Structure formats: structure tokens, C-alpha cells
């Protein structure tokens, strides 16, 4: 279905960390990485919440799932 999402999200990762790693990768740990580091996912969320308008949390989401690329774009489909 949409992939104005799917893209969106993984251009929104890609992005993130900068580099074109997870932009293939779909199980590039955001944490392991370091690729992410805590401002990002909320900066993200801020995306996810205006294109998505995703309602995930924040006070202390999952990062198990906001870990990986994959576990996101799921996050994302299971909001819509």
C-alpha cells in the first residue's frame, strides 16, 4: 500500500544517522550502531507524528523496537 510511508520512514532513517547503512540494512541495530544515540528517535517521532502521525511513546518506548529500522517501519504500519 502507501509507500510514501515506507520510504518516508526509511528516508527518515537514513537521515537520522546520516549515512546510507540503514537505507539497505533492515536490521541495522540504531543503538549498536550508534547511529542513534536518544534526540534522534525524538526528532524522528516528530516526523512520525506529522506524515505518520504515529502515537508511540516516549517516557520509555520499546527501543526494541525503535531499535531496529524493520521493527519501526512496523511500529509505523501498526499506527496507521
Same mark, same amino acid.
Given at each position: ?31 549498536? !550502531? ?6 534522534? !528517535? ?25 531499535? !531496529? ?12
Amino acid at each position: 500500500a502507501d509507500e510514501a510511508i515506507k520510504n518516508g520512514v526509511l528516508d527518515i532513517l537514513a537521515d537520522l544517522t546520516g549515512s546510507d547503512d540503514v537505507k539497505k540494512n533492515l536490521d541495522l541495530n540504531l543503538f549498536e !550502531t550508534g547511529l542513534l544515540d536518544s534526540m534522534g !528517535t525524538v526528532q524522528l517521532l516528530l516526523e512520525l507524528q506529522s506524515q505518520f502521525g504515529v502515537d508511540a511513546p516516549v517516557s520509555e518506548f520499546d527501543r526494541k523496537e525503535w531499535d !531496529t529500522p524493520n521493527k519501526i517501519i512496523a511500529k509505523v504500519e501498526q499506527a496507521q
